[PDB]
Amino acid sequence: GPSGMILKRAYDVTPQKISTDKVRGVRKRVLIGLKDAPNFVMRLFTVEPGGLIDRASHPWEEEIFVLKGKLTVLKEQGEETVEEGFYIFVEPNEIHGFRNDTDSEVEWLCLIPKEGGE
């Protein structure tokens, strides 16, 4: 494929509002998307106060790094809050979700194999 290097301020990427049956109060920035990635994609998620990504599972893994705030992670059994500087590995098919129980925006990097889209 193409040559070169992209270097960009992540916040300059246009966010997309996510509103589905299981997601509310979330915006996503596709940093390294399907148009460019040979193998896996990089997204930056922002969750507003009270926002929620309800428990779900999917047949690809997810790799996360928490960039800002206190993120509540929903698990098959119960929940756990993590903060900036934590990483999360979600195995394929593992139940997971996310909630923001704080008064300010929470952000994380999420990477998936490109077969799961962007």
Pick one of its own copies, Cu ion, none as the site partner of residue 54 (Cβ within 5 to 8 A by kind).
Answer: none
Provide the residue type at 111 as one letter: L
The answer to whether 103 and 49 have CB atoms below 8 angstroms apart is yes
* Cβ proximity of 97 and 54 under 8 Å: yes
Task: Please give the residue ranges that form the binding site for its own copies (CB under 8 A).
Answer: 1-11, 31-32, 36-40, 42, 61, 63, 65, 67, 73, 75-76, 80, 82, 85-96, 109, 111, 113
Determine if 94 is a binding residue for Cu ion (CB under 5 A): yes
Measured distance CA(52)–CA(74) in Å, rounded: 10
Report in angstroms how near the CB of residue 86 gets to its own copies at its nearest.
6
The entry of Cu ion, its own copies, none near residue 36 (CB within 5 to 8 angstroms by kind) is: its own copies
Q: Mention every residue, 6+ apart, whose C-beta is less than 8 A from residue 118.
A: 30, 33, 34, 41, 43
Q: How far is the CB of 108 from Cu ion (least distance, A)?
A: 11
